[PDB]
């Protein structure tokens with residue numbers, strides 16, 4: 001039960017509990033405002049602009065904003081008041097001048113951060129909308145900007161907005177979609193409903209909580225949709241005109257446009273010009289309002305978006321009624337992505353194996369692919385959450401998925417790799433750089449950058465702190481390279497060949513191959529460094545295989561066959577013991593399992609050096625199905641990349657992620673082994689393919705920035721993911737690798753390793769290199 005009024009309390013910062021009634025920006029969404037909130041706090045009279053007649057006004061309380069002589073004192077002028085009355089120019093009409101320091105008025109200790117989020121703002125609107133968006137174009141052109149910013153999967157509103165606030169993946173922070181079902185709560189998250197306002201859904205620590213816990217005044221970023229954009233801007237300016245001990249440091253504006261129009265008219269419709277003009281007008285109001293308060297050279301403005309917008313029509317819609325016999329007996333989260341769940345009551349004959357088999361490669365031009373969430377590409381980071389359904393359908397761009405058979409011309413939620421889903425970033429202000437383009441980056445990196453701008457120690461998150469230091473002029477975070485916990489052994493020749501009874505038979509460096517220093521193991525283990533002519537290895541003495549195998553292949557390297565006499569060759573390693581070696585007898589007895597090699601025998605320097613490739617310490621357990629993919633990569637693709645990139649350095653190895661949390665498994669978490677043995681079966685295999693950005697310099701004699709592409713290939717007993725897998729490997733293998741492309745940082749979480757420790761590059765640039773994703777778009 002509550003009582004009171006919002007006289008002199010409109011848009012209060014402190015969230016007031018009972019017995020007082022609320023007057024903050026979210027009070028309408030909880031149905032908790034005082035009786036007279038709409039009359040006092042949401043006035044619209046005489047619009048949002050001063051005219052000449054209004055100048056030199058007598059104050060009228062009914063007005064939305066004022067043009068009186070005493071408006072500047074109270075801090076509630078209309079944004080154009082000084083332009084129309086006092087003869088100032090609009091901010092957009094001023095020529096750009098570099099902001100070396102925070103040019104702030106008295107009382108402002110640190111530059112405030114204003115986060116200007118825009119819903120569904122596609123990356124290519126910056127160039128395409130330039131002429132109708134002059135204010136935005138001044139921020140982009142004269143501030144710091146990227147060509148695009150990558151969202152998180154699924155590319156939807158609530159997962160991305162809360163990812164911008166937390167720096168976490170949707171699997172971690174809990175908002176895995178715009179719709180969700182939690183089996184533990186036995187309740188449903190929806191866009192239309194009161195359930196979304198409950199805090200139990202919202203994990204992690206959002207930026208505004210991170211501020212207030214560290215003494216910095218912030219307040220919640222969420223606005224009620226009923227509040228018009230001009231009232232949101234005016235309120236933000238009103239908060240900036242509060243006294244020193246009441247004024248917030250961080251501010252958030254939100255625009256539902258261009259998303260709302262984008263769904264109806266498509267991303268580039270003729271009706272889409274006005275939405276973009278209004279968004280620019282809203283920015284021009286902010287900058288004119290900031291210039292009016294002398295904060296246009298003081299504030300840092302981040303202009304960011306949650307996701308893009310793709311052309312999606314009701315004609316391009318795939319129906320699961322065409323594939324499944326009993327489509328009425330399953331729940332689907334439909335549209336630009338698919339999540340399948342079983343109906344609870346009277347449906348004991350439900351089977352996820354039957355559903356995935358029934359949806360796998362049935363139409364030739366099939367516009368979606370079924371995955372178990374564990375088999376989804378690791379770049380998506382969409383698995384480790386009970387709210388994420390086991391069955392997932394990854395929908396093709398431009399298409400929809402539904403159960404059974406327009407209102408919309410556009411949509412979003414596809415793979416975050418897709419061009420149309422890419423969104424925007426512009427930093428403008430004293431702490432940002434001037435007229436500086438930067439490489440595109442992931443939205444998970446932004447939380448750290450906002451914390452640096454506010455002087456906050458960020459809560460644990462999925463950004464890589466330091467990777468966006470090149471965006472900022474000052475206030476950078478000094479990134480410390482993580483300390484290596486396990487030092488390597490360097491074993492000499494300690495074992496005779498007759499000591500090995502492995503059931504195996506066969507008729508029988510550092511500067512060249514380890515270019516960036518050795519990887520550092522950041523967990524407590526026991527491993528050996530093995531040197532060879534063509535490759536170096538960090539051989540795990542617990543997992544009985546390399547953690548990494550490093551090798552460089554020059555532009556003019558030889559690709560050769562495996563001879564007939566070395567077809568089933570496996571040599572013992574005289575540096576590593578019989579007890580810490582794999583055995584061939586396990587592979588003979590395991591019918592479903594075979595073996596492969598991390599360093600390819602195909603790329604050996606000579607017939608003499610080739611025998612090093614068949615060492616037992618180089619072999620790894622591979623399913624025959626996967627062995628087709630790995631062998632083609634090794635035989636054809638590695639040489640291809642070396643030829644194209646003027647040599648390449650490859651770092652290959654296993655990954656164990658049976659609990660699908662994106663982290664390296666401990667020995668206890670490994671859920672499968674080779675038959676009758678301690679040889680563990682990896683869930684994935686990685687390769688980090690590094691070369692010189694300057695293509696004129698070779699890979700092994702490179703100075704200047706490095707270039708990299710990597711992947712995390714799933715280790716599968718079949719090739720059901722690749723519909724062309726019946727055909728020759730050149731028609732499908734490289735397409736699979738492209739879908740499972742990864743960052744070096746993704747591999748580091750999954751392996752507990754740390755790469756690029758000895759280079760001639762700054763560590764901030766190396767962290768930027770580790771966060772890079774090669775998208776093939």
Ligand SMILES: O=C(CCN1CCN(C(=O)OCc2cc(Cl)cc(Cl)c2)CC1)c1ccc2[nH]c(=O)oc2c1
Pocket residue numbers: 115117119157161162163164165178191206221222223224225252253254256259
């Ligand atoms: O109805 C909505 C919006 C619902 N709310 C979103 C959150 N919100 C807000 O102000 O975000 C503020 C904010 C919060 C955070 Cl964590 C971080 C930042 Cl940087 C900013 C209030 C409105 C909507 C929008 C797009 C949609 N596309 C679709 O298919 O359905 C849709 C529904």
Ligand SMILES: *[C@@H]1O[C@H](CO)[C@@H](O[C@@H]2O[C@H](CO)[C@@H](O)[C@H](O)[C@H]2NC(C)=O)[C@H](O)[C@H]1NC(C)=O
Pocket residue numbers: 168169172173203204205381460461462661662663749
């Ligand atoms: C992304 O980062 C988050 C936060 O560091 C990680 O989630 C935490 O993981 C640990 C270990 O499982 C738990 O103790 C925490 O409770 C988790 N959540 C939070 C909110 O702190 C997550 O593992 C990271 N993911 C990846 C792929 O690196």
Ligand SMILES: [Ca+2]
Pocket residue numbers: 656657658659660661662663664665669
């Ligand atoms: Ca794991």
Ligand SMILES: [Cl-]
Pocket residue numbers: 154156176177178179333
């Ligand atoms: Cl969703």
Ligand SMILES: [Zn+2]
Pocket residue numbers: 119120156157158259306307
């Ligand atoms: Zn959105």
Ligand SMILES: [Zn+2]
Pocket residue numbers: 120157259260263412
């Ligand atoms: Zn939308």
